[PDB]
Amino acid sequence: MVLGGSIGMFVDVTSILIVVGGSIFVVLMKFTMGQFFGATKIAGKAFMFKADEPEDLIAKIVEMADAARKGGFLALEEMEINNTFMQKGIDLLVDGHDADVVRAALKKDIALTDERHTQGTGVFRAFGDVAPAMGMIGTLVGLVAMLSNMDDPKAIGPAMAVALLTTLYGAILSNMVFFPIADKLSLRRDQETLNRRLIMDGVLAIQDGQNPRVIDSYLKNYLNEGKRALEID
Amino acid sequence: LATLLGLIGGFAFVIMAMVLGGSIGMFVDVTSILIVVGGSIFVVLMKFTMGQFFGATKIAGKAFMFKADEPEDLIAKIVEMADAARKGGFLALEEMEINNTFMQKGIDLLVDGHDADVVRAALKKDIALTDERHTQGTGVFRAFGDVAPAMGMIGTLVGLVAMLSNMDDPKAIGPAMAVALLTTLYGAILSNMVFFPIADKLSLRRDQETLNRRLIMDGVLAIQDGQNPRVIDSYLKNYLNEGKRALEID
Amino acid sequence: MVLGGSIGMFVDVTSILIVVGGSIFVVLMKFTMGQFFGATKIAGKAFMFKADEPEDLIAKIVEMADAARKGGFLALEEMEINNTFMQKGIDLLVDGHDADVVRAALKKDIALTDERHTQGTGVFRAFGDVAPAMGMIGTLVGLVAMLSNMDDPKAIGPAMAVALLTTLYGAILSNMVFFPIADKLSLRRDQETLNRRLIMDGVLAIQDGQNPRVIDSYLKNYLNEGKRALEID
Amino acid sequence: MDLATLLGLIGGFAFVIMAMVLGGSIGMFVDVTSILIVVGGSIFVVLMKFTMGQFFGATKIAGKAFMFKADEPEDLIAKIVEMADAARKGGFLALEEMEINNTFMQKGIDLLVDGHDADVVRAALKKDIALTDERHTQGTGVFRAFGDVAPAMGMIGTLVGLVAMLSNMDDPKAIGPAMAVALLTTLYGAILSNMVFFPIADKLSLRRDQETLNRRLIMDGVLAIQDGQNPRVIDSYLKNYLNEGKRALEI
Amino acid sequence: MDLATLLGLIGGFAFVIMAMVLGGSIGMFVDVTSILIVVGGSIFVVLMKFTMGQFFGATKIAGKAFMFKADEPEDLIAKIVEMADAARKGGFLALEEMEINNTFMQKGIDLLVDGHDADVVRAALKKDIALTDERHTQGTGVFRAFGDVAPAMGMIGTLVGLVAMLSNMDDPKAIGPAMAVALLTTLYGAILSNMVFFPIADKLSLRRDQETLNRRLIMDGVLAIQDGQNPRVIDSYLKNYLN
Amino acid sequence: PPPGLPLWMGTFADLMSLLMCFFVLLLSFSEMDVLKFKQIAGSMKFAFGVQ
Amino acid sequence: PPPGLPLWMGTFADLMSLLMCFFVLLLSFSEMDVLKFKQIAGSMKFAFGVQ
Ligand code: NA
Ligand code: NA
């Protein structure tokens, strides 16, 4: 690109129109514009905000359990909360709700967040699926335009530019933008699932009045498995 | 639909952007589009009858021209006849104003007098009927999309052998090849931007109709049970956080 | 192959041999001769004939239902049944056997018909898979021949003709004959399985002893499952 | 040598003659570099997934499948019922006085006459059947892998040939033969995949089915002889088992 | 791996290299920028689905599948009935005197001899089996992802090189070599996809199946050992489970 | 569902269409010999049933 | 099951090969014109934003 020549040599209104507009049309035929904006919103929060470390969550849950055991079920409202899910857990525990209702609410939030991440992954994987099809369509369009105008170089140039740059844009958007965003959304979904499971188990242990010594051992049972197994011997 | 106005705008913009290099006549041919569509119709008709293809087309028409009722107006209406039943029994349901065929059928079966099991079975049968109908329409348009590029390439091959049988001027071979390839271009365009998108909007409308019909069935079952609108509000709004609208809430 | 102007352009013995004989060889390596001939017979039967309409099947079933209700298991002998499976069912009913054994036999026959249609579909899908591969082999052979003898015009023509017609024949056979035949075989499989399940339910309901009108309703329930549900408005 | 193999050999011969007639000669469909790329890369990839012993075993089983025709089940059933009569009117010791053309049947007969009980005889015969089935499955896997890799290797070799042709491209009006040589690698991959390796794997699957059926019939007959059942009863049992095992398309 | 298999691998590789050599200069097919494009792009795309720890774990598990062969099932049954006989003629402490053949088997017999219940040992061995199976699946996923992205990055590099060549032609006799260099990226992507990454993914899947079979056999054997069953019964059951 | 076609076939079609584009380009700044284009045109006519 | 490419993709690679080799045939008897090459090169740097 910059070493090959410049970024300026990959700019074309026709190629952008074909690839991006056709992809947007195809995707909007199966997704809502507001819903697509919501998927963009969740992708941006996944890219601009790192997921909380599971170890840090475990440690702070243990600290919260210590505070609860020392000062009853209302001792967690005077010091800062990291995430919104844990904040909701705290403000449901402060209401003296039973274990079943808070568990159901947390399991509803977990399912909702999992669904949102899965649907954002689906939106961006639809984009990545349609971009190379639009690139091939652009290759066909450019080939037709070249073969129709082999006597006119002024038409040969733009036609081949469209044919090449539609494929280049489709490939770049598919393999370096859309599929990577879907993969990052899947990773962020897995991190969300782990964090939500940890937080729900911590709230469950706090409600039961369990001493934090057992709580930390129980919470450690999640981090030693899963997608991270390639790091664990 | 807003996505449909965007559809029209995108169609216009992409055609105008595509045809700037030469004339619109290079990318426009009735013979090529006729070849692709006719071959696709013939192949699909060996696996769908005339009535089942016309059914898929008419359900596609309903899914495009019309718009599914929103699942919030449904909650509002359902709690309205719930209040009506709580105040004056099922005898107040018939005088209500209903613009939904499925809800109208449900309440018209309810007034007659039937227990939970039979009305639930009838509503589930209707839901399964509409679900299968939309699924088979999606299958029809998936078949069209699967076969359109193949038919376009068959048309291109026939055009190429017609060109290699008629070769005089070295300068006409290029336009002849472009016209032959136009069939492949049309097959790709019809596959990716017409038939597969129609199948996807049919599946989307299937999901929307299934959600609306489950909403209506639960509302009618609650009304028959005589439950108050309070718990009905929660047990009906909880269905609004699934699917893709779940991805829409912030 | 008519849009070229006539048929005499789209005919080569060489291309036909490369595509058809290669496909036949590959399919005969995949399938036995008996399997291939049975697939041909079942495809011919699916195309030249029509499965019995379910409406007439339910009408006939309620006819023998009322007949058995007026005369128990002895009246069924004296009316004509044009369907082999229904005749077999009523014979296994009137020969004094219990519901379990006749149901098992009818299930075995249904599974046999289903597997026969599935294997015929597999044979024609193998044909439709190999035909484009043979077209590509013919294209490669013809293109090597054409590019090698560029200085020999009289060798360029036939080589490119073989290359092009092999691909045209492979595409036409795959997408307009073999895959359509396989799809029609699948359609006939679904029709035959539905009809035979209808007949089995009618036979079991006559065996039990059931009201003709509830039998009719239960059978009408089967008329809204699949592509007839698509057709029904 | 079934008709499918015979049809394939005549088809390949006519294909070679056809290629030679179209191209004038045959020496232009032969390129040492293209053969080397396809064969060596395919062997490399397949040996990344199978051992040399597995490759040799697959080759041997393919050769045995294409050279020795499987015994017909009806002939085997006739042989078992004849042996049933012989053992009924001559005892177990009578089984060593007639020739048996089937090695699995001979092994079962030796295990039967050597005084082994039914349990060990059945276990050993089942082990032999499982070993034969595993050998056929392994051969099918090796040739399936060859069929999977040959066209990928052919496209790699065609890329190599295209790079070679383009590097030596001045005034492209002589790139014809070089492009043909580049295409030869994909031609080799296509022919080897669709017409050789996949057909061998499919014939090995069919031969697995035939050998499983034959060996199971032989095991049933041998076990029936072990218990000394009546020859008519075991004939009926074997005929029924053969008929119910027939594929639906053949019925 | 076996010496014969290794010699076959080297022979195939040498046949490919000699074919490339016989088709002209070998510096025509060598470009540092192209291999950097393919490898760096593949790494960039794959690191957005797998962390560096996961990539290195997959690399290690694929490497130890090329230098270690899965233990043969028959050897496993023979050995498990061997320590079965040892336990029958001796005790559970007799298992300690038996030297190391498989780490999974070794840790299983250690957890059996240190005084644990049958069910807890079964649960631990099941957890280990699942961990190894998922590790092999993750390694297969890493290498499948590499094989999926390598052709994509190769085509991206080819398209970029060709766009750069068309941006300033200035010479017609230089058109061909420029496209050859641009196609080198596609060549490298195809070679890495079909000769390195996809074969390693398939090999890891095959070893996943073999390891699951071997570890299930070992688990059943040690469970029977804690049961104290007749070693002949154990052998018959395991041989039946083979088929 | 059918397994589909392998990824190398997609690579092969992308390479083929790319080379098509570039050979159309090469033929754009070229002058076909009209004399040598009618021998090939006659041969294609002969081999396609017209002649 | 992991998906793949449509079944017509092989026919597409076929067609692309056929058209590509037809263009190679046309380029076999076509002499280069340098003036057209200069025009096409200028059009290429104009359509690629290289001016
Ligand atoms: Na393009
Ligand atoms: Na083809």
Author numbering:
A (entry chain E), C (entry chain B): 20 to 252
B (entry chain A): 3 to 252
D (entry chain C): 1 to 251
E (entry chain D): 1 to 243
F (entry chain F), G (entry chain G): 11 to 61
Which of the paper's sentences describe this entry?
Vibrio spp. are highly motile bacteria responsible for various human diseases, the polar flagella of which are exclusively driven by sodium-dependent stator units (PomAB). The flagellar stator unit uses the transmembrane ion motive force (IMF) to generate mechanical torque to rotate the flagellum, which is employed by many bacteria to direct their locomotion in liquid environment or on viscous surfaces to a favorable niche. Five PomA molecules arrange pseudo-symmetrically around two PomB, with each PomA subunit comprising four transmembrane helices (TM1-TM4) folded into two radial layers.
Single-particle analysis yielded an overall resolution of VaPomAB in Lauryl Maltose Neopentyl Glycol (LMNG) detergent of ~2.5 Å, with the cryo-EM map of sufficient quality to build an atomic model for most of the protein complex. The local resolution corresponding to the inner transmembrane domain approaches 2 Å, with clear density for non-protein molecules, allowing us to model water molecules and ions, as well as residue side chains isomers. The PomAB structure shows that the D24 of two PomB chains sit in different environments; D24 of Pom B chain 1 interacts with PomA, which we refer to as an engaged state; while D24 of PomB chain 2 points towards the cytoplasmic domain and breaks the interaction with PomA, which we refer to as a disengaged state. Examination of the high-resolution density map in the vicinities of these two aspartates reveals nonresidue densities.
